[PDB]
Amino acid sequence: RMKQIEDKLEEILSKLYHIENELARIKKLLGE
Amino acid sequence: RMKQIEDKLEEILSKLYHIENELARIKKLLGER
Amino acid sequence: RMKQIEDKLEEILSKLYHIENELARIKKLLGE
Amino acid sequence: RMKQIEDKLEEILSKLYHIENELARIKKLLGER
């Protein structure tokens, strides 16, 4: 059951990368 | 405990989609203003 | 080794709650 | 795989502290402006 966990974790990370890109766009809209 | 883990996984995944959608609304609000 | 994982997961969640509070403060500073 | 899991846990935990700190800088920037 490691693999079903690792799978979700990968998916979790990928959300965090997508969040980082939302915050890159936002920081630029903000003048930083 | 695996069920518990798996709940916790999902609960994290939901707060992530919620986070992403509150960011995406902030982003739209700054892009149109 | 479930418990060492569940532990980190709890900790992960707690970060996400803290992020939500950062975004509550920010949304109000933004007029929403 | 547990080592892999444990790496992945930590990698998520780092992007979380990084996320939190970029939010905290945005928050300061809007509170002082």
UniProtKB/Swiss-Prot annotation, chains B, D:
Ranges where the record places region Leucine-zipper: 5-26
Cellular localization per UniProt: Nucleus
Post-translational modification: Phosphorylated by the cyclin-CDK PCL5-PHO85.
Mutant phenotype after disruption: Abolishes recruitment of the mediator complex to the upstream activating sequence (UAS) of amino-acid starvation responsive genes. Decreases RNA level of genes involved in amino acid biosynthesis and cofactor biosynthesis during amino acid starvation or methyl methanesulfonate stress. Growth dependent on amino acid supplementation. Sensitive to amino acid starvation. Sensitive to purine starvation. Decreases cellular glycogen levels during glucose starvation.
Signal peptide as annotated in the record: none
Domain of life, source organism: Eukaryota
Induction statement: Translation is induced by amino acid or purine starvation, or during growth in low or poor carbon sources. Translational repression during nutrient-rich conditions is dependent on four uORFs (upstream open reading frames) present in the 5'-UTR of the mRNA; these promote ribosome dissociation. Translational induction occurs in conditions reducing translation machinery efficiency, leading to ribosomes scanning over the uORFs, and increased translation of the mRNA. The rapid translational induction is followed by transcriptional induction at later time-points, independently of the uORF sequences.
Family: Belongs to the bZIP family. GCN4 subfamily.
Its biological purpose: Master transcriptional regulator that mediates the response to amino acid starvation. Binds variations of the DNA sequence 5'-ATGA[CG]TCAT-3' in canonical nucleosome-depleted 5'-positioned promoters, and also within coding sequences and 3' non-coding regions. During nutrient starvation (low or poor amino acid, carbon or purine sources), it activates genes required for amino acid biosynthesis and transport, autophagy, cofactor biosynthesis and transport, mitochondrial transport, and additional downstream transcription factors.
Subunit composition and interactions: Homodimer. Each subunit binds overlapping and non-identical half-sites that flank the central CG base-pair in the pseudo-palindromic motif 5'-ATGA[CG]TCAT-3'. Interacts with the mediator tail; the interaction with GAL11/MED15 is direct. Interacts with the SAGA histone acetyltransferase complex. Interacts with the SWI/SNF chromatin remodeling complex.
Domains (record comment): Residues 89 to 100 and 106 to 125 define the N-terminal activation domain (NTAD) and the central acidic activation domain (CAAD) respectively, which can function independently to promote high-level transcription of the target genes.
Protein name in the entry: General control transcription factor GCN4
Organism: Saccharomyces cerevisiae (strain ATCC 204508 / S288c) (Baker's yeast)
Range of the intact protein held here: 249 to 281 of 281
